[PDB]
Symmetry: D2
Subunit: 262 residues, 4 copies
């Protein structure tokens, strides 16, 4: 069917991309980077994230596949030596699709609104000065956070920034998001929960400014300074990312291979 | 309907129990501690845990209610001053039931099998010497754990031992269990994941002895030395605990009230 | 003797400053903010830090005193109601001096050199992109750090940023500095020590760029973007800050009062 | 001079011990395990700890040396292949001695007193039930600890149990001890400092029972149940352990080799 291939851009990934295109030419596969049905990413997890954001408006029509040209990427879970086997299996199709949950981030301003989708996480920091936000969960004031920032992670993002912040690793069949603290201050007058928090679908987490209304907001690799922010709202998206799966590579085995040994 | 009341046993809880029994006597309520349909616990969370384990073979026929005579208990979420209001609302019924997930623990021996249900968590430590187990997830060898022990928590247990071990706090609508480490050793030859792990329903986590086969296994307050252990298996139970709910007391508000301020 | 008084600048601190100046006028005390021998800070710890940096070139000629107008400040350990008692005791003198260690930070450039003194800590982050430095301890390559940044703390700084990063609290009679990580990445290819590190006098810790040579370097409240950095060197300073002490207020009691209860 | 050699007891360590004894026989060296001046430990860090405790009453007359027959031991920092080189250098002498600080533990009872010396750490846990102690620092009540236990570490012990508990790694030229928590409970009624605490010489840390007076107290590998405990006192010992050093192996390089890569 229609497919496209993105490359990290080094000589090794470009050559693998050219060889796969040549192999696809031997099948009823059409290269189309406007309306692909398969998106192949050749590089690392950064490359895969750029592919996801390149096509985040057609997520329900696309199955993604990652090939890692360096060491094992968490989303890019094919080795370059297996590219021909992958061309052949994709060409026939009949593969099964697997879906991971996504995070929806809404940024409200004063006197419109922007929404973003994250595959790993969205974070919030101040624009230079102290970072202070009120954390409101389902319209209930939960805590006033003082510290470096906050991180809201998807399940597949839990092995990324979330992990370095002390968060739990969560299986991606769980439709949830996870909020972790960056260096909270805690004394007898300033108090946060400390622990990571895991939220189900339909729970809304709202960050509201206390003094400064300018924030540095990241969504995956993208980081933008937002001014005149009234609110930042987090919820599990209704949208999901779909992967083409051709063999068993369980999440916990992927975790083992990335952090324990391989 | 049929009900019973357990008390922590101090003078204050016994008197509240006697007064509630007297108030129930003014309604079509029969005291029956063999086949209750309502189980009221007066005391603390320890009292509530004993009530749950007293009736864990009739969980689907029972709705639980906790009254906290000390500071706020996480399961015991009525104040003693509200006991009369609670008698009246229970008597009429028409309340809604809320369900929390439970943890199933299976202990296998050599040359039978024991199962246990946990509302907070189950933990494993050695019987005195070094603690070393292989952690197997869905039949996949994940890590060899060396350290003080391991803790497997339910969602409502995540605010208990799990929290002190660095675990995430998880909303109890999520059907999951969470595994946390106790003082793992990590150097260039011994390696664990470090991070808490969150598992969905139908995932099985198996601990298998490496040298010593004797372990101290806790389930909630109960702690027993098990000998000749071949395997300890954790999974989300199919069984659930049901609470009688008469007003909104959201989980995240309960978390706020217990750890932030009240 | 010669003295000066700095104020946080709100109405309450300015009035206390004016009243102390009036009280000092009744003694052989001369107001001199060029060559003071006593520097009184009225405000919070931020105010005290600005006072220290205002006079960091005459530290050996100055004894510092802090008055906290809000809740207890860690350096500002007199209440406003005790200001008159403090005027009287300072006027007579015969007080004892207590000394805390300081941190020296050297920043080297390519094709000069800048040094800074810190009372709380110095931190390093990237100028926007990924943060990667090689950590060299006494000319020995120790680790390649990948993450958000690094924090080097004095002993009295250990209750500040260092504490939020998981660092140990160290008694200020110990002449040491403490290095803590901010969100290090650790997988099977990236590896850091994780643990805070505590260094004695005469040990030198050097951070050396790997790719990007631009860094955001903080020293206490001051944060500056440094370009073309070749090296950042940390060592315990030979210089010390001196406090005027009039009564026993032990460090561990100050810790208790700030974080446990008061 | 007078020397002795302890072995872990496996075939490999016994053979190395016999060969070193044979090599020492070619010099003016006398085997004496009553009053040695050199104590050689062949095995692992457990073997080295047993050697230290075998001779803890003659620490000022003894220099210790460790040979690691498995992977690098932190105290046992010679490889077996270097044993002959070590025999020759010891025989001539003229080596330099290096000293590490030790921890003194005093256990007081009701109606005598026991003291112990630790090279790694001393820990305290309950005898089965809840662990609750009051932590008193230089006669000042600091906190009431509720949790699994407490760990007091020497500097060279900071890479051992202390590290797994989140403690800082401290250079052994610093005369200090470090207190770390094991799974403290923290809510709005129970409160501990959380952070590791680092104490200088002459500071005394006293643990005092609240309800139960029975405790499991470890000193290095030894663990004893103590009954009728009135107090447990920790301070940096006046005694030190002395190592024979023949070449530079800096502490931070030893840390790198054990935890980063080798
Ligand atoms: N400079 C520090 C950041 C860094 O080196 N990131 C790349 C590494 O992270 C791995 N990775 C990614 C990825 C990626 C691409 N990243 C770079 C780009 O796109 O340019 C952006 C992501 O960076 C993460 N991140 C940022 N700061 C971090 C920090 N302090 N600690 C840990 N992660 C941090 C955020 O989560 C962000 O989404 N996703 C996952 C995943 N879901 N599971 C496990 N591994 C994963 C990837 O294989 C590399 O090994
Ligand atoms: N001695 C230390 C343990 C202790 O003081 N426990 C009682 C306190 O914990 C609170 N609590 C309980 C409870 C209870 C009754 N417990 C006593 C009994 O039954 O005798 C047994 C439970 O103890 C926990 N536990 C054991 N060791 C712990 C440690 N090191 N750190 C933290 N928790 C620890 C385990 O999880 C066990 O299930 N369940 C929850 C909950 N789901 N959410 C939030 N708070 C909760 C309760 O209101 C008290 O404030
Ligand atoms: N916006 C977050 C930062 C913040 O609120 N800081 C002020 C609070 O911290 C207390 N404080 C200070 C102080 C101060 C003045 N600070 C403000 C100014 O000068 O404008 C600059 C300092 O900020 C610290 N800091 C920065 N980011 C932090 C973070 N994420 N977590 C914790 N601390 C953080 C750094 O260490 C810096 O030196 N020194 C100590 C001390 N030695 N012992 C115990 N308490 C202390 C002070 O009483 C306030 O309660
Ligand atoms: N079963 C868990 C404990 C364990 O495997 N211990 C041996 C390993 O630890 C290394 N080690 C030792 C040692 C030793 C001998 N140990 C065994 C014996 O004597 O039988 C007793 C010691 O055990 C430590 N320990 C106890 N529980 C622990 C836990 N949960 N996490 C981490 N350490 C733990 C305590 O501190 C105790 O003193 N001293 C140091 C040191 N100063 N620097 C760095 N590495 C060091 C040694 O090379 C092995 O790699």
């Amino acid at each position: 069917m229609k497919y496209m291939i993105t490359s990290k851009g080094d000589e090794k990934s470009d050559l693998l991309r050219l060889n796969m295109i040549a192999g696809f030419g031997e099948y009823d596969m059409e290269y189309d980077d406007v309306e692909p049905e398969i998106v192949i990413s050749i590089g690392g997890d950064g490359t895969f994230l750029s592919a996801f954001h390149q096509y985040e408006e057609r997520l329900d029509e696309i199955a993604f596949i990652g090939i890692h040209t360096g060491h094992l990427g968490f989303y890019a879970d094919w080795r370059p030596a297996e590219a021909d086997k992958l061309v052949k299996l994709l060409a026939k199709g009949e593969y099964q699709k697997v879906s991971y949950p996504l995070l929806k981030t809404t940024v409200k301003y004063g006197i419109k609104e922007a929404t973003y989708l994250a595959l790993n996480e969205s974070t919030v920091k101040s624009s230079g000065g102290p970072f202070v936000v009120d954390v409101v969960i389902n319209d209930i004031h939960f805590e006033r956070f003082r510290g470096d920032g906050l991180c809201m992670s998807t399940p597949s993002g839990t092995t990324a920034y979330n992990k370095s912040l002390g968060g739990a690793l969560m299986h991606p069949s769980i439709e949830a998001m996870q909020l972790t603290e960056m260096a909270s201050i805690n004394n007898r007058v300033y108090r946060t929960i400390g622990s990571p928090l895991v939220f189900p679908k339909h729970h809304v987490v709202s960050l509201q400014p206390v003094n400064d209304k300018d924030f540095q907001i990241s969504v995956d690799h993208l980081s933008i300074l937002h001014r005149d922010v009234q609110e930042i709202r987090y919820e599990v998206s209704a949208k999901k990312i779909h992967f083409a799966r051709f063999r068993s590579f369980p999440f916990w085995r992927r975790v083992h291979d990335s952090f324990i040994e391989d």
